Symmetry: none
Subunit: 152 residues, 2 copies
Amino acid sequence: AGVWGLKVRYEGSFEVSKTPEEVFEFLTDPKRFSRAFPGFKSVEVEDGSFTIELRLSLGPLRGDARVRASFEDLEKPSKATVKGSGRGAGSTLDFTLRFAVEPSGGGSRVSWVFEGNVGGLAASMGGRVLDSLARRMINDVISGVKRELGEA
Amino acid sequence: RLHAGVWGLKVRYEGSFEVSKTPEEVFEFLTDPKRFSRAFPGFKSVEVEDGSFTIELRLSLGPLRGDARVRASFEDLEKPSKATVKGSGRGAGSTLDFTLRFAVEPSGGGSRVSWVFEGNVGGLAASMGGRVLDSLARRMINDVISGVKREL
């Protein structure tokens, strides 16, 4: 026998003009933050847990995908953790996302760490390709966050 | 983009091979780094102290070609049959963190060696498609097993 899967970690931070309270509220409201995702299709929210359906264009990795997740840590207006899984037509993701919001000149800095395990179709693609695709998703989400908050 | 990420490939291989020697003879060989390191193609050096060891290799695998170092320790031991080796390795562009477990059992008078190798691969080895790394990994495994047979 011989088998494999991928482990991934990303970390970063970005700044927005909004107050930490306004930013934390947005980043803990799935109905609002789901619209930051490229290819957003729908969201369901209850009891701190949510599922987002997306159309992926990312792509060798394409088509409908579903992310199901729950808040764990949730300390207003400064820190949150989300744990969940993602599925497309042939791939799996299990992940943890931790973020912090701090005052930054009356604006906010959002700092974040994503860790995940990827299985299925995608586990073959190798890190150079997957990094390209992951960076597209991250940039699109962060741009979406800035857009939905009314930055610029 | 103030974000960065890294990908690692988690791999598991399992196998068995037979050898024309007694379990005690095979087990002694497989627990003496001065003996078993010679099984590695590209072997340059091994230094032992006690139950812990550092091997330096010239790899020619590869895309994966160059100087490599592994530092490992025997972590579990059952003096005719079983052992565990845990360690880590690096070249100029890739990393490895691994556990190898083996059992030396009797068979046909002689012995059979059954083993499981689990690795987290980083860097260049992880950036390539998982399918390319798999072919290289099994090539190395085959060359090492051949080297074991030769040395014995």
